Amino acid sequence: CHCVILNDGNFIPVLGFGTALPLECPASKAKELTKIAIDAGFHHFDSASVYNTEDHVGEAIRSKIADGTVRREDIFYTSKVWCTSLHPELVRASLERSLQKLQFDYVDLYLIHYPMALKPGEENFPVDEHGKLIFDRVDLCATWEAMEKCKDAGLTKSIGVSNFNYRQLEMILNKPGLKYKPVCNQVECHPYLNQMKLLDFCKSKDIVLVAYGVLGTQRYGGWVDQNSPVLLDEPVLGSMAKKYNRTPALIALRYQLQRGIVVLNTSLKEERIKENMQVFEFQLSSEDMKVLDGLNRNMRYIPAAIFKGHPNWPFLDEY
Template sequence: MAHSKVPKVKLYNGVEMPIFGLGTWKSKPGEVTQAVKDAIDVGYRHIDCAHVYGNEQEVGQGIGQKIKEGVCTREELFITSKLWNTFHRPDLVLPACKQTLKDLGLEYLDLYLIHWPVGYKEGESKFPADADGNTLFSEVDYVDTWPEMEKLVESGLVKSIGISNFNSEQIERVLKVAKIKPAVLQVECHPYLNQKKLMAFCKERKIAITAYSPLGSPDRPWAKPEDPQLLDDKKLKEIAERLKRSPAQILIRYQIERGNIVIPKSVTKSRIAENFDVFDFELSKEDVEHLDTFDCNGRICPILPAKNHTHYPFNIEY
């Protein structure tokens, strides 16, 4: 079986999570079902989803089809989803999780994350705004959301819980109230934003890190033509040429060498396969250290509509 070559990260609760998975942010509903099917055929067993991506039903169709074909079992898969900002109010957490399960066609999630520490005003819209286009915020504090996440574990709907885009102070606040500790922190991570300090902080607390946008998210909707493109970085290309690999493979391997879970997104079959083909080579310690020097605090997902929120995560160093 091809997928057995993917190493697993053991979470503090004993759950094993494949160190490599498929990201589905920005994957259009029409193409994401095929991407999921191609990925599972190639050997991916970890798929990262979120309600706000608006494509969980299509992701679920791909998963369901492959289970039905006998390519994999549900138990072999590791499926992550995320609680969106408009569902932080305690009474909305369970219904939100159930909606995601229904959309994905699953009975449980392997991992469920609070997507952002910022709550948005509850209601129909995922991006509530006033007449001037300013995002409307919720009064709810994420520490009051966390006990509801714990109940999802207790009821068996979710195996592990975690957080995404939280800074070190926010993680500490969750740990203070937690009966069930967060198992994973998912954050933007790539050589331009290497997250070394946050990684060290999480390691001390036995929280695993999932690196999102590991390739620099060149297709992010708000990219400007003059923005530096990580995949085109000359120094990165030099490493890739020396090792006869693609720049994307180097960036994925960089996270694996650091012990981070990594979830590159693609909908192109050849790239889905290429991104997976990273388990027959290694980067030297020197290569990893060299890539670390690219750091320029180059954050590409700053969630600017929430920058005036009390719990905006990026006002401190890490």
């Protein structure tokens, strides 16, 4: 497998397929896209409880195992516990519910979606009369202890985090009695926001940086500035694509793989799912990698703006 090794010994495919879909897409769409992705050669699938696509994704995977296309052990499935279940006593219950939806006995990786707790309840986005999210206070170190228990319970093989800044990672890494270090930190990363600093930090701690937004994000309404520039329309990517006889998307994907990053990607088009697998066919020169490094402009497509004000908002700029 085009895999890299996690700090707990487990292997993870460097190219994963994201199962989050635009609000304008029917949930069931996730099932068909997953089947196409599997046939295209994808083994790593990224999901979350908040995506409401887990049951459909699980159906596609179980279907592909049933007909002998792949085995459960060959699939790397990731889930994430949402802000409303960060309370230590609610973490495992959330994972068990996901497993129930998937018809799985275990997930390969389980992440804390955001380092920001929200009022517990069925509603994923509890708000008051002003439409403001209802924040809740939770000890993330305790949340982590609960994640470790899930690993020891065999409900998940590995555990990690998502959307954590290095300061928050250090808190966990320096935790008294720490048992398992996060194996990864899934964050937004692309030429407009190359996370060089956070990447170097993660590498120094044996933490894998898993990137989303590698192609500019699906630009979800209510989460991304619709007036922000479209990443793949960047002239530099267009020019480099022609130089290497590839596509702007392939240039953006290869850029990250060559930096030691595990990449996620999503496309609603079958032709593009297959195309993205071609990222393993070519190499970007060291000089062109520097050119791409020059596109950095601190453009964060998903700032989780509705979370601003929360004591743990992870995206404050560096000094």
